[PDB]
Amino acid sequence: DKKYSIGLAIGTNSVGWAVITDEYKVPSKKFKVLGNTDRHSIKKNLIGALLFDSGETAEATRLKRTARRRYTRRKNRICYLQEIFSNEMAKVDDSFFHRLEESFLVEEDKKHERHPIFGNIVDEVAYHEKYPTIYHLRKKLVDSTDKADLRLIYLALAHMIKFRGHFLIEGDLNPDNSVDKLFIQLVQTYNQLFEENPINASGVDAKAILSARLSKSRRLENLIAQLPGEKKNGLFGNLIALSLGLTPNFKSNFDLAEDAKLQLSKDTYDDDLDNLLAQIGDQYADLFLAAKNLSDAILLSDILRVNTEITKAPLSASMIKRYDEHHQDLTLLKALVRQQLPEKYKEIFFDQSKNGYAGYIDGGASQEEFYKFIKPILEKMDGTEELLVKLNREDLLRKQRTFDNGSIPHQIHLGELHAILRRQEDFYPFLKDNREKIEKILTFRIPYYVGPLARGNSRFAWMTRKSEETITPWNFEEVVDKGASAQSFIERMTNFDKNLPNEKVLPKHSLLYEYFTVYNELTKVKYVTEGMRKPAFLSGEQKKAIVDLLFKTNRKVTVKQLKEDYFKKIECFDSVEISGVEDRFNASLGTYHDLLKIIKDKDFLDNEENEDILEDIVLTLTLFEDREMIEERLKTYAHLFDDKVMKQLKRRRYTGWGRLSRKLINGIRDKQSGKTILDFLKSDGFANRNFMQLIHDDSLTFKEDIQKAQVSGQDSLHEHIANLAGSPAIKKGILQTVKVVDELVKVMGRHKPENIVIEMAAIVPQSFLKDDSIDNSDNVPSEEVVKKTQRKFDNLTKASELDKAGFIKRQLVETRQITKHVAQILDSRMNTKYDENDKLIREVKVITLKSKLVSDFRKDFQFYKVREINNYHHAHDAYLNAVVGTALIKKYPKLESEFVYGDYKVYDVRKMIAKSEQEIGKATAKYFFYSNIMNFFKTEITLANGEIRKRPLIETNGETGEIVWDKGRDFATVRKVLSMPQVNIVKKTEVQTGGFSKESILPKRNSDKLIARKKDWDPKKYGGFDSPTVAYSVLVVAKVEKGKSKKLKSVKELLGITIMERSSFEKNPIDFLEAKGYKEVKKDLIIKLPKYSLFELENGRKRMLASAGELQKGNELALPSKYVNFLYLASHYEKLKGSPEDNEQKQLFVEQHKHYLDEIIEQISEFSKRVILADANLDKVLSAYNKHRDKPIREQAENIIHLFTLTNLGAPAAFKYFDTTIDRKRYTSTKEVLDATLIHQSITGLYETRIDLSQLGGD
RNA sequence: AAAGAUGAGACGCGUUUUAGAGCUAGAAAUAGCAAGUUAAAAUAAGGCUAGUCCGUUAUCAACUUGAAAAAGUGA
DNA sequence: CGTGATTCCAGCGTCTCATCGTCTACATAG
DNA sequence: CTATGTATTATTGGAATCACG
Ligand SMILES: [K+]
Ligand SMILES: [K+]
Ligand SMILES: [K+]
Ligand SMILES: [K+]
Ligand SMILES: [K+]
Ligand SMILES: [K+]
Ligand SMILES: [K+]
Ligand SMILES: [K+]
Ligand SMILES: [K+]
Ligand SMILES: [K+]
């Protein structure tokens, strides 16, 4: 337990781990076995792999949460409507709302009459005859002037309020702006603005061209083609694009330097148009407004298919048109089918199982499915021409409520609602008094920047209230503080400072932040003239003069300006040499110049007084995006500026946030000096310390205060991992990796390893770079051959040394940053002590390897992997990672800085790359000359052609002399390790969480498996759910009554506690089980069993718990290494990137060892007979193997790779041997595992607790 | 620039039970014909903290001391 | 009654907002 | 190493049914 290394392979569903020693060998130990078994210890190799289900994202959970909120709020608005109608409805029908609430119940459970609207059969039939759909009643109430029944009024208004349409269009809308007329007026406006360049709209059918249901760009192409001499990218073309909904840029048409993209749907369009008009002039506003009108026209013409002058209800009229055409076409279709195809009539109009009209109306068939089913039937008959035209138009036998009604904006429903209220407020005073209340109920939306209207019990809410009361759609503006809420909406998701976790970060365009950047860059600027002797820092006076004379007069400050406008003008230097800045100063004072342009008061900007004002203004311009809220917030400073300045300030807006808070820049001060960070940046004697120096100076209290303020935690590992940027699945993997490393360190007596290697899921000679991609005579094809992608062409025509070092690095370094974070976590956990110079003592080196390294190693030295055989390949990948990484760092220690985490010296490879010498390059201190850091592993290397260079058997480090790779002794070690059959494969047991059951609301069925959707909704009458998800099973040992005599009988069985049942069972298990039917339960014998709990039965047969009523295969099939390599080589039969002679040798090995095939089959059968127990499936598999014995070896090997599904760990799965389909043999009973041996495994599986369940019993 | 991650506000369907008096013929399970497009209510059971809030992400071998939280146990 | 074999099946589309980090290249520092 | 700046797709448990003992 002294000197060892750990190799790790982190994945989305698995973490492979391995422990290696000095000689790249995997140790083995005797681990104690706890429990009541006859085995008290077991032998374990220190190598394995942890398997686990994928980590899920929160997307589905959030979508269901928002759906819940939307259903709640829709119910609430309907309740508001009923509350408004309460008293007058009670005067009309005291039980109308009651019946509308008990509509779902059956008549047995109904407390009032079964007819909802009128409470008697005659009036109900009369209403359904007079108004066949709700839209007929909507149109009638819109158009008629007669007094109407208050109940029908409520029904129409409630249908509109319950389903109100989208809110994607801002402002009011009317069918007055419905395509030819608005196109004509747009053309008139364009020709008015552009007299000299008029456009001809004659013969250009705008309605048909712009309303053809096709893509937008295609409609634009069609319309532009109708205008000769005009282009899609022209001004009129851009207007047609803006009207169609595309995003055109008017930067080319009006000759601009900024890119002003305009889209009508975006919320910024109001401000975007004002921006463009500030660049082009207000005389074009009319034009863009006409364009918007045209867009409205297109949308409304696509939605409304009726004349908008005959009725004020165009949408209801279009729905009634749908209904009438449906009626007529169904009559015609029934007649035609009765006449021509009479045998299909029953199938079409009575078989809900078929996708005919019967399955289209009463079955689950969709409109698309019905069209696909009935198109050939229409084609076979006569008189179906118009029906087929309507079918190909997706307009045949349509329903009123369909998937595309998502186009309807809330303005249309609101117009119809307002029309009804206008018509009926003449007869009902309460309607006239509450008209705006009802319209507000329909229109009101909680702004996205407000969030949930909570009162201190929602972790999602940030809204703040002006008064603490109930919030209604009518008092929202008075109770909710929209300003503070939209401030929090942004500040919840803004980063805090890395040094101060309690202080919000500054805006990026903050004057304080820009001063910080400028001064931090300016302190480190040095200058030398011919007179002076040494580089000199800029004093505080010099920095102040440079800031006042250059940064406050220019937007960008160049080094030429620093030399001429200051060192020459002020210091009177004719020649100055400036370092610390190359061509120009990266930092600049942009917001300073912007505000100087806007307010035109330099003394206001330079007075360190108005700062807090200016800062706040910039904050207001960044924090908020709504113009009205920006105005409301800047109203406090209105008295400081002119109203013109106030408007120009409103129009200015910024985006972006910095990395440092206001406190660190200017808040905290050094104790003895009393100066902030910016004060030291303005003047720090002759040291001119910068941010990093200041916060990391032990002679200042900045460092100590930063360490104190780091009281956000004292922080949890789960929190550090959770806060990382990445997918939740890889984060689950990282947490499992850290826990595995902790357990492995504890296994070695808390001894820390030497290294930890982590890996996360020939034109140019292969001696230089093993690039086998699309992009890929000596180094390159010779010049004579050249005479006879861009990177590909450059490498081909390159006919190096620096590119060789670049290859060395590209073959080596891991650019992915999540791996850097994993390395930092492991390193900070391992290395915690500091030396005499207070620098970290890296006892453990954390190495990061690319998967390409171990992949190439496997392919070069024939340690092939076959992922379909078993799960060992993860552990093998971890072991190979350990081996390759440790050997690689021992061979070339100078490359530490490239792949080992930590601040180390970056001495590079240009020195290590030898000269053109090869024979002396291996003797000199230059590390090596050939450009593959993986060449020292081979005994011979081939720079293409036939010139084979040779390497020694033993490879060592040149300087230290430590042996790094004995080619005679280490490859055999790797082979023996990869051949070990005992590998610790542990499937992470997990309690099942999530949705209670299957979301499908099933019909009524006489089955106890049905789950009531409400307490009182007996599923035998109302249907319900089935298929619950078992959170975990429970081993119960108790007695149940039996027979009519209720005699107690001892039992031992598995009860599946569902996710819905979990909290009730955990609150009191005894009462839960007794309610389930068990009596006298041994509470101490209750065993909780999560999914994938492991049992061992007879002859080593293992099973994992899939649920309380199903099991999964629990054994691994350890196939010998020779069969694995044979399967790899035989299944490929493709060029293995190796020399054609090596390919021929591998093909000859494949053909010489064909008998292996049979042996593999045998190896499967012996396994299945022992463990799988799928007699019919195994017999079918054997017959299929004997059937295709004449097939080529490659295809037989591929289908054997397929065969391994029968023996894999986990859930059974169907597979195929050629064309033979083997269905899954499932273990539909968990009765056996009640008497087997339960195995509780630690995360590595090295620690076990075995419980003989046969001991448990009530006799 | 997009992806992804996270949060917020909305829209449209889907599904369930009920209401849409089916008629005629026979001793009759039933048969023939007619009809079908719409609505109401629910949309995780529910919780208390009673909000126009929350309820499907993350985390979880065994054992021991343990209000609980945390550690400790085994070549 | 039970066990094995064999089917069958599983809520999903659309839009509007916002923030974050990925990702290399220099330069200053720890 | 770190901090700051400029530059689109299957899977697998529940449920039922049917043969067969
Ligand atoms: K979520
Ligand atoms: K959804
Ligand atoms: K609810
Ligand atoms: K889980
Ligand atoms: K849990
Ligand atoms: K929509
Ligand atoms: K909805
Ligand atoms: K008859
Ligand atoms: K659901
Ligand atoms: K486990």
Side-chain angles (χ1 to χ4, degrees), chain A residues 906-940:
Chain A
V906 192
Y907 35 14
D908 263 358
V909 189
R910 303 178 61 176
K911 138 187 62 67
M912 298 163 41
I913 291 306
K915 326 295 289 189
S916 282
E917 49 175 78
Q918 181 78 72
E919 297 181 339
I920 307 190
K922 38 190 174 64
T924 46
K926 295 154 166 296
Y927 267 7
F928 271 126
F929 173 58
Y930 273 154
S931 324
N932 243 28
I933 35 92
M934 298 290 287
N935 279 161
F936 75 102
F937 277 136
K938 314 202 188 178
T939 321
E940 83 172 312

Coordinates of all heavy atoms in Angstrom, one line a residue, chain A residues 906-940:
Chain A
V906 N 7.0 25.8 -18.5 CA 6.6 25.5 -19.9 C 7.8 25.5 -20.8 O 7.8 26.2 -21.9 CB 5.5 26.4 -20.4 CG1 4.9 25.8 -21.7 CG2 4.4 26.6 -19.4
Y907 N 8.9 24.7 -20.5 CA 10.0 24.6 -21.4 C 9.4 23.7 -22.6 O 8.9 22.6 -22.4 CB 11.2 24.0 -20.8 CG 11.1 23.0 -19.7 CD1 10.0 22.3 -19.4 CD2 12.3 22.7 -19.0 CE1 9.9 21.4 -18.4 CE2 12.2 21.7 -17.9 CZ 11.0 21.1 -17.7 OH 11.0 20.1 -16.7
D908 N 9.6 24.2 -23.8 CA 8.8 23.7 -24.9 C 9.6 22.6 -25.7 O 10.7 22.2 -25.3 CB 8.4 24.8 -25.8 CG 6.9 25.2 -25.6 OD1 6.3 24.6 -24.7 OD2 6.4 26.1 -26.2
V909 N 9.1 22.2 -26.8 CA 9.6 21.0 -27.6 C 10.6 21.4 -28.7 O 11.3 20.6 -29.1 CB 8.4 20.3 -28.2 CG1 8.8 19.0 -28.8 CG2 7.3 20.1 -27.1
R910 N 10.6 22.7 -29.1 CA 11.5 23.1 -30.1 C 13.0 22.8 -29.7 O 13.8 22.5 -30.5 CB 11.4 24.6 -30.4 CG 10.0 25.0 -30.8 CD 9.9 26.5 -31.0 NE 10.8 27.0 -32.1 CZ 10.8 28.2 -32.5 NH1 10.0 29.1 -32.0 NH2 11.7 28.6 -33.5
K911 N 13.3 22.9 -28.4 CA 14.6 22.5 -27.9 C 14.7 21.0 -27.9 O 15.7 20.4 -28.2 CB 14.8 23.1 -26.5 CG 15.5 22.1 -25.5 CD 15.5 22.7 -24.1 CE 14.1 23.0 -23.6 NZ 13.3 21.8 -23.4
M912 N 13.6 20.3 -27.5 CA 13.5 18.8 -27.4 C 13.6 18.2 -28.8 O 14.2 17.1 -28.9 CB 12.3 18.4 -26.6 CG 12.3 18.9 -25.2 SD 10.5 18.8 -24.5 CE 10.0 17.1 -25.2
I913 N 12.9 18.8 -29.8 CA 13.0 18.3 -31.1 C 14.5 18.4 -31.6 O 15.1 19.5 -31.6 CB 12.1 19.1 -32.1 CG1 10.7 18.8 -31.8 CG2 12.5 18.8 -33.5 CD1 10.3 17.3 -31.8
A914 N 15.1 17.3 -31.9 CA 16.5 17.3 -32.3 C 16.6 18.0 -33.7 O 15.6 18.4 -34.3 CB 17.0 15.9 -32.4
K915 N 17.8 18.2 -34.1 CA 18.1 18.8 -35.4 C 17.7 17.8 -36.5 O 17.0 16.8 -36.2 CB 19.5 19.2 -35.6 CG 20.2 19.7 -34.3 CD 19.5 21.0 -33.8 CE 19.9 22.2 -34.7 NZ 19.4 23.5 -34.1
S916 N 18.2 18.0 -37.7 CA 18.0 17.0 -38.8 C 18.6 15.6 -38.4 O 18.3 14.6 -39.1 CB 18.5 17.4 -40.1 OG 17.6 18.4 -40.7
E917 N 19.5 15.6 -37.4 CA 20.1 14.4 -36.9 C 19.0 13.4 -36.4 O 18.1 13.8 -35.7 CB 21.1 14.6 -35.9 CG 20.6 15.6 -34.8 CD 21.6 15.8 -33.6 OE1 22.6 16.5 -33.8 OE2 21.5 15.1 -32.6
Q918 N 19.3 12.1 -36.7 CA 18.5 11.0 -36.1 C 19.3 10.1 -35.2 O 18.9 9.7 -34.1 CB 17.8 10.2 -37.2 CG 16.9 9.1 -36.6 CD 15.6 9.5 -36.1 OE1 14.7 9.9 -36.9 NE2 15.4 9.5 -34.8
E919 N 20.5 9.8 -35.6 CA 21.4 8.9 -34.9 C 22.0 9.6 -33.6 O 22.1 9.0 -32.6 CB 22.5 8.4 -35.8 CG 22.0 7.5 -36.9 CD 23.2 7.0 -37.8 OE1 24.3 7.6 -37.7 OE2 23.0 6.0 -38.5
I920 N 22.3 10.9 -33.7 CA 22.8 11.6 -32.6 C 21.6 12.2 -31.8 O 21.8 12.5 -30.6 CB 23.7 12.8 -33.0 CG1 24.8 12.2 -33.9 CG2 24.3 13.5 -31.8 CD1 26.0 13.2 -34.2
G921 N 20.4 12.4 -32.4 CA 19.3 12.9 -31.6 C 18.9 12.0 -30.5 O 18.4 12.5 -29.5
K922 N 19.0 10.7 -30.6 CA 18.7 9.8 -29.5 C 19.8 9.8 -28.4 O 19.5 9.3 -27.3 CB 18.4 8.4 -30.0 CG 19.3 8.0 -31.2 CD 18.8 6.7 -31.8 CE 19.6 6.3 -33.0 NZ 21.0 6.0 -32.7
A923 N 21.0 10.2 -28.8 CA 22.1 10.2 -27.8 C 22.2 11.5 -27.0 O 22.5 11.5 -25.8 CB 23.4 10.0 -28.5
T924 N 21.9 12.7 -27.7 CA 22.0 14.0 -27.0 C 20.9 14.2 -26.0 O 20.0 13.3 -25.8 CB 21.9 15.1 -28.1 OG1 20.9 14.8 -29.0 CG2 23.3 15.2 -28.8
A925 N 20.9 15.3 -25.3 CA 19.9 15.6 -24.3 C 18.6 16.0 -24.9 O 17.6 16.0 -24.2 CB 20.4 16.8 -23.4
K926 N 18.6 16.3 -26.2 CA 17.3 16.4 -26.9 C 16.5 15.2 -26.7 O 17.0 14.1 -27.0 CB 17.5 16.7 -28.4 CG 18.2 18.1 -28.6 CD 19.0 18.1 -29.9 CE 19.4 19.5 -30.4 NZ 18.2 20.3 -30.7
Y927 N 15.2 15.3 -26.3 CA 14.4 14.1 -25.9 C 14.3 13.2 -27.1 O 14.8 12.1 -27.0 CB 13.1 14.6 -25.4 CG 13.1 14.7 -23.9 CD1 14.3 14.6 -23.1 CD2 11.9 14.9 -23.2 CE1 14.3 14.8 -21.8 CE2 11.9 15.1 -21.8 CZ 13.1 15.0 -21.1 OH 13.1 15.1 -19.7
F928 N 13.6 13.6 -28.1 CA 13.5 12.7 -29.3 C 13.2 13.6 -30.5 O 12.7 14.7 -30.4 CB 12.6 11.5 -29.1 CG 13.2 10.3 -28.6 CD1 12.7 9.7 -27.4 CD2 14.4 9.8 -29.1 CE1 13.3 8.6 -26.9 CE2 15.0 8.7 -28.6 CZ 14.5 8.1 -27.5
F929 N 13.4 13.0 -31.7 CA 13.3 13.6 -33.0 C 12.0 13.3 -33.8 O 11.4 14.1 -34.3 CB 14.5 13.3 -33.9 CG 14.5 13.8 -35.3 CD1 14.3 15.2 -35.5 CD2 14.6 13.0 -36.3 CE1 14.2 15.6 -36.8 CE2 14.5 13.4 -37.6 CZ 14.3 14.8 -37.9
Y930 N 11.7 12.0 -33.8 CA 10.4 11.6 -34.5 C 9.3 12.1 -33.7 O 9.3 12.1 -32.4 CB 10.4 10.1 -34.6 CG 11.0 9.6 -35.9 CD1 11.6 8.3 -35.9 CD2 11.1 10.4 -37.0 CE1 12.1 7.8 -37.1 CE2 11.7 9.9 -38.1 CZ 12.2 8.7 -38.2 OH 12.8 8.2 -39.4
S931 N 8.2 12.5 -34.4 CA 7.2 13.4 -33.8 C 6.0 12.7 -33.2 O 5.0 13.4 -33.0 CB 6.7 14.3 -35.0 OG 7.7 14.7 -35.9
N932 N 6.2 11.5 -32.8 CA 5.1 10.8 -32.1 C 5.7 10.4 -30.7 O 6.6 9.7 -30.5 CB 4.7 9.5 -32.8 CG 3.3 9.5 -33.2 OD1 2.7 10.6 -33.5 ND2 2.6 8.3 -33.3
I933 N 5.0 11.1 -29.7 CA 5.4 10.8 -28.3 C 5.1 9.3 -27.9 O 5.4 8.9 -26.8 CB 4.7 11.8 -27.3 CG1 3.3 12.1 -27.9 CG2 5.5 13.0 -27.1 CD1 2.2 11.2 -27.3
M934 N 4.4 8.6 -28.8 CA 4.1 7.2 -28.6 C 5.0 6.2 -29.4 O 4.6 5.1 -29.6 CB 2.6 6.9 -28.9 CG 1.6 7.7 -28.0 SD 1.6 7.1 -26.3 CE 0.7 5.6 -26.6
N935 N 6.1 6.7 -29.9 CA 7.0 5.9 -30.7 C 7.9 5.0 -29.8 O 8.2 3.9 -30.2 CB 7.9 6.7 -31.6 CG 7.2 7.2 -32.9 OD1 7.6 8.1 -33.5 ND2 6.1 6.4 -33.2
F936 N 8.2 5.5 -28.6 CA 9.1 4.7 -27.7 C 8.5 3.4 -27.3 O 9.2 2.6 -26.6 CB 9.5 5.5 -26.5 CG 8.4 5.7 -25.5 CD1 8.4 5.0 -24.3 CD2 7.4 6.6 -25.7 CE1 7.4 5.1 -23.4 CE2 6.4 6.8 -24.8 CZ 6.4 6.0 -23.6
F937 N 7.2 3.2 -27.5 CA 6.5 2.0 -27.1 C 6.8 0.8 -28.1 O 6.8 -0.3 -27.7 CB 5.0 2.2 -27.0 CG 4.6 2.8 -25.7 CD1 3.7 3.8 -25.6 CD2 5.1 2.3 -24.5 CE1 3.3 4.4 -24.4 CE2 4.8 2.8 -23.3 CZ 3.8 3.9 -23.2
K938 N 7.0 1.2 -29.4 CA 7.2 0.2 -30.4 C 8.7 -0.2 -30.4 O 9.6 0.5 -30.1 CB 6.8 0.7 -31.8 CG 5.5 1.4 -31.8 CD 4.9 1.5 -33.2 CE 3.6 2.4 -33.1 NZ 3.0 2.5 -34.5
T939 N 8.9 -1.5 -30.9 CA 10.3 -1.9 -31.1 C 10.9 -1.5 -32.4 O 12.1 -1.4 -32.5 CB 10.4 -3.5 -30.9 OG1 9.5 -3.9 -29.9 CG2 11.8 -3.9 -30.6
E940 N 10.0 -1.3 -33.4 CA 10.4 -0.8 -34.7 C 9.4 0.2 -35.1 O 8.2 0.1 -34.8 CB 10.6 -1.9 -35.8 CG 9.3 -2.3 -36.4 CD 9.5 -3.2 -37.6 OE1 10.3 -3.0 -38.5 OE2 8.8 -4.3 -37.7

